[PDB]
Structure 1
Amino acid sequence: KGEELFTGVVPILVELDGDVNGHKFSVSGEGEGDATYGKLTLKFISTTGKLPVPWPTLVTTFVQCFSRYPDHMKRHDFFKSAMPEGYVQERTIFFKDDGNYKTRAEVKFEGDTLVNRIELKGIDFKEDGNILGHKLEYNYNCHNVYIMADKQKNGIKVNFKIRHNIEDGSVQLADHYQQNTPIGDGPVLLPDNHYLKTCSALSKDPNEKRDHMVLLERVTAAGITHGMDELYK
């Protein structure tokens, strides 16, 4: 079905307008995905100047439909099943001992292009916190994304904890509460419990002047039966 839509490489467009503790900013991303290898390549650029928050804090915000689901786990892939029409992705991200982001996004095909348009509001951040104070290392760890069906909503409930290395020394945890629901009136794949093993590499474009981020990410569905295909482990 929608599965077919991901047979190969898909171009992606990402749009984000945000406001954190009153700071207004805008980001635009482009790149492509290949669910066959569970691989994404993306570049984002702030259009509103220097980013008021660390790039890393937005990674998760900025298309799980690109995950790699093993053949045997295909009945579990809500994301792809959800579309041509797309899904709405809503989240509440709690930065431990700090503020929080609430986000609402729509992911769907617009032509040949897989698009992710986002609205983000962040509040209660500490002016000299790890976030506003930009105390995060420019890096990213691997994380297990837990997935569950949400029968009642005809979608899924997703939960995970991101671990942000603090330049000072420890880790800044960010707890993610996530919900996905189909935009269309079609039937979707409500899966059995599972998870995606995810890893992201953050870099920069030497020949790029605006504040930006280059993201290389890989996602492999897991939790039901072991695969050698598994990213980590």
Structure 2
Amino acid sequence: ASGRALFQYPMTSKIELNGEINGKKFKVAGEGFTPSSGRFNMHAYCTTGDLPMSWVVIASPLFHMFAHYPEDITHFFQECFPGSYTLDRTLRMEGDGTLTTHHEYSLEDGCVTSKTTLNASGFDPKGATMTKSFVKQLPNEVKITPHGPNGIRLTSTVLYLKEDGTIQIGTQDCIVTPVGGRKVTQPKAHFLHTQIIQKKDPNDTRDHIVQTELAVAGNLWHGMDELYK
């Protein structure tokens, strides 16, 4: 059983995230549900106190294997199993700071566990990330291309809405690498439409978020694959 055969829904998730921003250390944990392909949630919470950054900015650090892929594009993230992959991210909040994340995953009993680290340095203490002045991030198309002999690269530019109704940009660039000592067939260049919706659980007493991601792959520009060898 491998690949898409291993991703029979419903499934669940867990996360453990160790972080630091501008010298402030913190941790997050969470559990989530994946009812069906492409719709995946996460209820996460800060276990060290209040989160020292925006929940909106931490949303992309908080599971591409749950994306919904049509049959005509390779689902690289799912094809990495068994064996797994790592994700390495850089998120530049333009005019403000840069963070990086590293993710490792394992799959057991229908649950994907993420163990992630986050490092963020140089942020403005009156910026929106540290003052928690974001409301949401807008939906976006992540561009996925073959990268090196055995990985992929994911790139996006994200619009973050502040409380005053204006936008800040985050430039995001990620590399995914199979860690399974085996060759995984690269997909053609394509796009991943992604939306994040966040809310609060009225009862939960912790600093937390309840997040859903909807992620659907498509060959949005059929000529694009020709540019990536």
Alpha-carbon displacement from aligned partner over 1:185-228 (angstroms, at most 9, x marks no partner)? 123131110011111211111110100000111111112589xx
Question: What is residue 140 of structure 1 aligned with on the other side?
Answer: 137
Q: Tell me if 1:211 matches 2:207.
A: yes
- 1:32 aligned counterpart, secondary structure: strand
Which stretches in structure 1 are left out of the alignment for 5+ residues?
227-233
Q: Work out whether 1:194 is the aligned partner of 2:190.
A: yes
* Equivalent-residue separation in structure 2 for 1:189 and 1:145 (angstroms): 20
Mapping for residues 77-92 of structure 1, pairs under 5 Å: 77-92=75-90
TM-score, length basis structure 1: 0.90
Query: Which of 116, 119, 136 pairs up with 1:121?
Result: 119
Partner in structure 2 of residue 158 of structure 1: 154
Tell me the distance in 2 between the aligned counterparts of 1:42 and 1:4: 23
In 1, Cα distance between equivalents of 2:83 and 2:14: 16
Q: Does 1:180 align with 2:181?
A: no
CA displacement at 1:150 relative to structure 2:
1.0
SS in 2 for 1:40: strand
Q: Which sits farther off after the overlay, 16-25 or 217-226?
A: 217-226
TM-score of the aligned structures, taking structure 2 as reference length: 0.92
Deviations 1:123-178 (A, max 9, x none): 100011111122211x23211010011133x1101100111101123111111010
Q: What is the match of residue 223 of structure 1?
A: 219
Distance in 1 of aligned mates of 2:18 and 2:138: 25
Secondary structure of 1:54 counterpart: coil
Q: Is this contact kept in 2: 1:64–1:79, CA < 8 A? A: yes
* Larger CA deviation: 50-59 vs 1-10: 1-10
Partner of 1:99: 97
Q: Which residue number in structure 1 is paired with residue 146 of structure 2?
A: 149
CA gap of 1:108–1:100, structure 2 versus 1, over 3 A, is: same
| 2:66 aligned partner, one-letter code | F
Identity among equivalent positions (%) equals 30
Is the 1:140–1:202 contact (alpha carbons within 8 Å) kept by the matching residues of 2?
A: no
Query: What is the one-letter code of the residue matched to 2:49?
Result: G
Cα contact 1:99–1:125 (8 A) shared by 2: yes
**Unpaired runs of 5+ in structure 2?**
223-229
Give CA-to-partner distance per residue, 1:6-26, whole Å, 9 cap, x none. Answer: 122111011101000011111
Q: Secondary structure at the match of 2:134?
A: coil
Amino acid at match of 2:22: N
Q: 1:54-96: per-residue Cα shift (whole Å, max 9, x none)?
A: 10101111110001111222xx211000113211000111001
Equivalent AA in structure 1 for residue 143 of structure 2: Y
Residue in 2 that maps onto 1:230: none
Regions of 4+ moved over 3 Å: none
User: Number of aligned pairs?
Assistant: 221
Root mean square deviation, CA, Å: 1.5
In the alignment, the residues of structure 2 paired with residue 49 and residue 162 of structure 1 have an alpha-carbon distance, to the nearest angstrom, of 28
AA aligned to 2:5 is E
CA contact (8 A) 1:12 1:30 kept: yes
**Match in the other structure for 1:66:** 66
